[PDB]
Amino acid sequence: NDCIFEVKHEGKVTGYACLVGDKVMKPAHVKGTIDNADLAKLAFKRSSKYDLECAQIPVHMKSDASKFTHEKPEGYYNWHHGAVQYSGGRFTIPTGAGKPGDSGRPIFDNKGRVVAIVLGGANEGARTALSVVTWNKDIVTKITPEGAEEW
Amino acid sequence: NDCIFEVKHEGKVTGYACLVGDKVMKPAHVKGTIDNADLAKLAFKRSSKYDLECAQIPVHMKSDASKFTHEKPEGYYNWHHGAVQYSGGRFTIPTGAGKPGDSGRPIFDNKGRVVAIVLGGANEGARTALSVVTWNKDIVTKITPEGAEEW
Amino acid sequence: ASHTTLGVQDISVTAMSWVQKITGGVGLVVAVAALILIVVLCVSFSRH
């Protein structure tokens, strides 16, 4: 971990930016700028389809970016605020495990690799399904549960 | 095992609806409405060839949906009234283990995943062949032993 | 009249062409829709 930067709003933290691979990824629904001036001045490319703003990491001075994988076997993953269960095509956590302002947090596998970025989720009763950004071997894809809200 | 999410659908109970994956499933041959108003109000899509009616599970109660798989290796499976033997591609139970009114009962594998839904069966001596709804990858199919009666 | 009656079978060539074009237009749409339904029924029949 420790690759997480706060996105500062006029008066609060509204989410986080994560360093994954050679890119810094931020949810587009999060408003504000990155706390670290070196990333704040960095140009970003926005996509409403994937709800992402991504930019190339100044890796020459940013070698702490997390490792990542496209592999997503059924099992449990670590997402900072607790354990997240992956089953079928969805990531699931306890309903009180997450909340608005937590978006931008990565989901890690048991080898310490980043699997997905949390955008939000839907309250399904006992559990909440997460709206996440994932990638396959080629491209980024977006998984959104019905009724999911941005966090 | 303890995933008892079968829902009765009549004053005089005649089979059960089950929550599997993202869908509410019940036999099409059973009369009556689901006791749970949240499900009873749903529109159901009816197919006479599969003896099956389905509807999307409401988000607020989706956490209670069971897990499912298309994998059906030869071996033993469990259900509410006992064990189910899968042999020769067919599901078989001890005669008398089931009865009329048991339609809609899920069959679970050893991981707690649903593999099939019971519609009825046929009496072959000490053993009863089950008429079931099963899945292959992304398709629903039905198995009907000769002389099988609806439950 | 020095001639006989016309009858319903005798229509102008231009009008006949229009009738065949319109009849064929609808008949073709039906034939296509019929083929689609037949294909779906055959596939639905084949699968079990």
> Which one-letter DSSP state was computed for residue A73?
-
| B114-124 vs A33-34, strand pairing mode | unpaired
B55, B48 in Cβ contact below 8 A? no
Q: Hey, is the C-beta of B149 within 8 angstroms of any chain A C-beta?
A: no
CA distance A28 to chain B (A): 25
Closest by Cα among C38, C44, C36, C40 to B48: C44
Q: How far apart are the C-alpha atoms of B64 and B114, rounded to whole Å?
A: 13
Query: In the annotation, is B51 catalytic?
Result: yes
Structure-determination technique: cryo-EM
Q: How far apart are the C-alpha atoms of C42 and A90, rounded to whole Å?
A: 36
H/E element, A90: strand A90-94
Q: Which residue has the tokens 């931020």?
A: A26
Hey, what amino acid is at C14?
T
Mutate which of A86, A93, A124 to test chain B, going by most B C-beta atoms within 10 A? Answer: A124
Q: What is the CA radius of gyration of chain A?
A: 14
A128, A118 in Cβ contact below 8 A? no
User: Could you tell me the CA-to-CA distances from B75 to B78, B83, B90, B108, B111 in Å, in that order?
Assistant: 10, 10, 11, 12, 13
What residues of chain B lie within 8 A of the CB of A88, using their CB?
A: 21, 67
3-state secondary structure B50-88: CCEEEEECCHHHHHHCECECCCCCCEEEEECCEEEEEEC
| Cross-strand bridge partners of residue A16 | A6
Q: Name which of A88, A92, A122 is nearest B59 (Cβ-Cβ).
A: A122
Hey, what amino acid is at A134?
T
Other beta carbons within 10 angstroms of residue B141's beta carbon come to 12
C–B contact: 3+ Cβ pairs < 8 A: yes
Q: How far apart are the C-alpha atoms of A98 and A15, rounded to whole Å?
A: 12
Q: Hey, is the C-beta of C47 within 8 angstroms of any chain B C-beta?
A: yes
Q: How far apart are the C-alpha atoms of A120 and A133, rounded to whole Å?
A: 10
3-state secondary structure A102-134: CCCCEEECCCCCEEEEEEEEEECCCEEEEEEEE
DSSP string, B2-44: -----EE-SSS---EEEEETTEEEEESS--S--SSHHHHTS--
Q: Which of B2, B9, B22, B29 is labelled catalytic?
A: B29
Mutate which of B62, B109, B137 to test chain A, going by most A C-beta atoms within 10 A? Answer: B62
Q: How far apart are the C-alpha atoms of B80 and B118, rounded to whole Å?
A: 11
Q: Name which of A87, A126, A147 is nearest B59 (Cβ-Cβ).
A: A147
CA distance B142 to chain C (A): 6
- A113, with CB counted inside 10 A (0-12, 13-18, 19+), is middle
- Return the sign of the alpha-carbon dihedral for residues B148, B48, C42, B135: negative
- B50, with CB counted inside 10 A (0-12, 13-18, 19+), is middle
Q: How far apart are the C-alpha atoms of B107 and B1, rounded to whole Å?
A: 10
Q: How far apart are the C-alpha atoms of A126 and C42, rounded to whole Å?
A: 44
Query: In the annotation, is B29 catalytic?
Result: yes
Helix (H, G, I), strand (E, B) or coil at A13: strand
C44/B141 Cβ within 8 A:
no
Q: How far apart are the C-alpha atoms of A32 and A104, rounded to whole Å?
A: 13
User: Could you tell me the CA-to-CA distances from C45 to B14, B53, B70, C37, C39 in Å, in that order?
Assistant: 30, 19, 22, 12, 10
